[PDB]
């Protein structure tokens, strides 16, 4: 799996990655709950200071088949950064990553999927995989139980449809996880996909899902 080259799509035929951003939060543990319910293992790309502060759920995570990645401290868009900006922004992530995990990912996505030359040279130095997306729920934007369904999910099936498979979507957000996390693995079911990690769904042994 090469580092520091945008990585959109799964290479294992019949995989879905789904993906949750900026997390953990306090809907994150019925999330875990309703994964495991369909055998479902999912990639938690999270934050800073929700990181430092929920060390259990980043273990709840790993102990549970889920693959914890990197999503900066801050959330700052990283095109905005300069080398060391950019550096101390992963480091920081992973300097409270580790003693939860022992390790720290070595798979990450940028906020807002935003990149430059820039940052892709800085993930290959750091030794990251870049991960964004096939799949664009737009959750953030559908917050209501009407939205949520209405674009949403009907996103994700027309994506989906069209051979999208690395899915986003953000764990923060109650109606993610109180409605779409749910008909999202009502369709993973009822279609025949296997929902693993984004290492999983790229052929990467989850020994290379940290370093
Ligand atoms: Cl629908
Ligand atoms: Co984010
Ligand atoms: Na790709
Ligand atoms: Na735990």
Redesign the pocket.
């Known amino acids: 799996v090469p580092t520091g080259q ?4 799964c290479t294992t035929p019949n995989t879905i990655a789904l993906t949750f951003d900026d997390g953990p939060s306090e809907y994150t543990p019925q999330l875990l709950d309703l994964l495991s319910r369909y055998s479902a293992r999912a990639t938690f790309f999270v934050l800073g200071d929700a990181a430092a502060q929920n060390p259990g759920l980043l273990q709840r995570m790993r102990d549970e088949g889920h693959q914890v990645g990197a999503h900066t401290y801050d959330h700052v868009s990283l095109p905005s950064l300069g080398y060391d900006g950019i550096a101390s922004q992963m480091t920081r992530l992973e300097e409270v990553i580790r003693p939860a995990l022992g390790v720290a990912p070595a798979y990450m996505r940028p906020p807002y999927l935003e990149t430059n030359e820039l940052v892709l040279q800085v993930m290959r130095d750091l030794d990251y995989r870049v991960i964004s997306a096939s799949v664009d729920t737009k959750d953030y934007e559908n917050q209501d139980a009407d939205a949520i369904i209405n674009t949403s999910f009907q996103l994700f099936l027309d994506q989906l449809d069209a051979g999208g498979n690395i899915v986003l979507a953000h764990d923060i957000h109650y109606w993610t996880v109180a409605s779409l996390a749910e008909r999202m693995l009502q369709e993973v079911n009822a279609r025949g996909l296997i929902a693993t990690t984004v290492g999983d769904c790229l052929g990467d042994g989850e020994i290379a899902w940290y370093h």
């Open positions: 945008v990585i959109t799509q």
